[model samples]
Target: SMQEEDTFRELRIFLRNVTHRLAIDKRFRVFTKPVDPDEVPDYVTVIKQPMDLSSVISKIDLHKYLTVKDYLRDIDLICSNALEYNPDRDPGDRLIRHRACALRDTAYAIIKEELDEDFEQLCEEIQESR
Candidate 1:
């Protein structure tokens, strides 16, 4: 009932705090916005769906995430999408994928450090509530 509503908001609070930390990080800063299709013209052709930190921020601000994993999925998608787009084709985008991996690891590390027990407990509670 209302408990789901209460916990949902609390879940968003957790998402907001963790993403705020991610947004400030130097590594995470690189993908803060959508990939400029104008700059990388071929990007759109290869990557049909794009995920970025800014979109993640927008989703959290709009209260779009229903569960802890949902938010994390987007986080994971940002990096995975980069790897998909860049891959090991050329020199520059090779480094782009490398940065992508580093960004993902850094993101997970921050969540592991910043939220700790709170993050774990939230995930468990969300699952239990479902």
Candidate 2:
């Protein structure tokens, strides 16, 4: 009944930190918003579940992520979608895929530095409490 008092308190801040880190990266600026399906009809078809940093921000504000893995899933989805959609090795695809790799590595570096262990502990605590 009183589950809302302290859930994801510091963890939420961690999520924001990750989001802010991506926001500040110059390459991530364009990744802020969803790619309009109208602008690229085939994109939606290819990337059935599109993800963006702005969308991630919205989810954080809404407290939609129940676990760190949930947060990481969305972060990973954005880049995976980018790389998959931009499969060709020529120009736009190559350039965009490179940035996607950068974002993926940076996100992993930040999370792996600390959050990964924290999340595992969180999961253990929750499981034990139940």
Candidate 3:
């Protein structure tokens, strides 16, 4: 899917900055610890799945979901759809992915505008959640 490709490309661009300064010291390599099969990040990050679902959800509620339940549910669906088109696994489904992306962007915009603190700060810590 174009969205996935776009996402990968965007990720490449984002990551490019991290490797911009290469050196002989392998120890300086970007440190992304491989995910332990059972370990995970914030579940909401799943919205950043393969497709641009987050972008799509963002469009619908750039700042106006009446309740937290609605907000969480809407974001959940966005992530689920995005997981479907994770470019590493699926590709070439542009229409649906595009729609999802737009909605997600809108929702994120709203989140950015209304949330009092960084989303990461509001959530349960991995140790506590378990």
Candidate 4:
């Protein structure tokens, strides 16, 4: 759980920087999105099934989520295009990797924001029931 939180916090900071950077100059406008929403996405679909012994919920592998792989692909495409247009100012592959890293980081923050209130309510309910 702690690892998940840290991962998300890192992503959120990256996204915050991305949005802020885009605002700082028109060149960074590549990061801007017109319809930014409150939710990241329900990229994972979990299902429960009855096994031989009992019921089990299928495991969700976080690495397959859109924020992790899809975002990285998008970043790579952006950097490739940017480099093709302006070869000298490409800033190398590291910058592109870093941009993707930012996206992954931002997703965590979004996840936390989406769940924190509900999590608190759940905790309160548990306490009351106890």
Candidate 5:
């Protein structure tokens, strides 16, 4: 076993690039905050912090979150496609991919948790109305 230190740079690059591209979309405001001038990355102001699931659920509609989840799934597919096309993969790069998957899964879990809560509340409301 070895300490995984170098992968931080790759993580930052992936976040910066993915966030930057998605930031331009109007739906991005639902999950990510406005990029701060102080936190600007090397190439652009791609820096962003993902909002907590509770905050997202309370402030924005659920459909927006569903759309964002689809976007994340697409990113996962892109990662797989890249790995498939490149047969000679570096061990370090593969390790980085695993880290990315972990982060994505964590985010997905949070969203699903909030969705479950919302659905339960909806059921209660329907019972009250009936």
Candidate 6:
């Protein structure tokens, strides 16, 4: 179990790196905020927090992603990670989902500089794995 768990952990980090790299190459434009001497500590704090995912998900209209060329693989990873948090099944669940959504929404809002659309779809892709 230990070996399996360790390997699994490594794979998770590997996939995360892949996701980040692909995001950059696709011009997602996600960037680390420029650090000023005074802001360096604060910026590092923000970077260390992964709970900001909620806002990001909330801001995304899954439907708006209807035609992305890499939609299937992208959504697969997104959905998979989202489910991996369920305790009975995943390491996450609704509370984590909310947290993630908040983070995603907040980050994406800042990234785009405004709420450009009001009709974005907001449905959680329900999973019943336990």
Clashes per prediction? 0, 0, 26, 5, 0, 25
Whose lDDT is higher: candidate 2's or candidate 6's? 2
* Worst window of 10 by summed lDDT in candidate 1: 114-123
TM-score of each: 0.78, 0.84, 0.29, 0.27, 0.31, 0.25
Instruction: Flag clash pairs in model 1.
Output: none
Poorest 10 consecutive residues by lDDT, candidate 2: 1-10
Worst 10 residues of 4 by lDDT: 50-59
Model 2 residue 84 CA deviation (Å) reads 1.4
Point to the candidate with the largest lDDT.
Answer: 2
Please identify which of the two predictions, 3 or 4, would achieve the higher TM-score against the true structure.
3
In model 6, how large is the Cα lDDT of residue 61?
29
Q: Which stretches of candidate 1 lie over 4 Å from their true place?
A: 89-91, 113-130
Q: How well does candidate 5 score on lDDT at residue 71?
A: 40
Task: Tell me the tens digit of each residue's lDDT in model 2 across 9-121.
Answer: 66677888888999899998878888876889888888988998898988988977767778888988988898889889799888888898788789888888867686657
Between candidates 4 and 5, the one scoring higher on lDDT is 5
Candidate 3 — which residues are off by over 4 angstroms? 1-92, 118-130
lDDT of 3 by residue, 9-72 (tens): 4333422322232212243121112223365454335434322223323433343332333444
Worst 10 residues of 3 by lDDT: 23-32
Predictions in order: lDDT: 0.76, 0.80, 0.38, 0.36, 0.39, 0.33
lDDT tens digits by residue: candidate 5, 1-130: 1122223233334334445544444433322442234643431322122232233333323223223333455445433433443335687557545544444464455445533445434434533554
Tell me the spans in candidate 4 whose CA falls farther than 4 Å from its real position. 30-72, 81-130
Q: Candidate 3, TM-score vs. the true structure?
A: 0.29
Output the TM-score of candidate 4: 0.27
Model 6 Cα lDDT, one tens digit per residue, 12-38 = 343344334434432222222223438
Error of 3 at 7 (Å): 36
Clashing pairs in 5: none
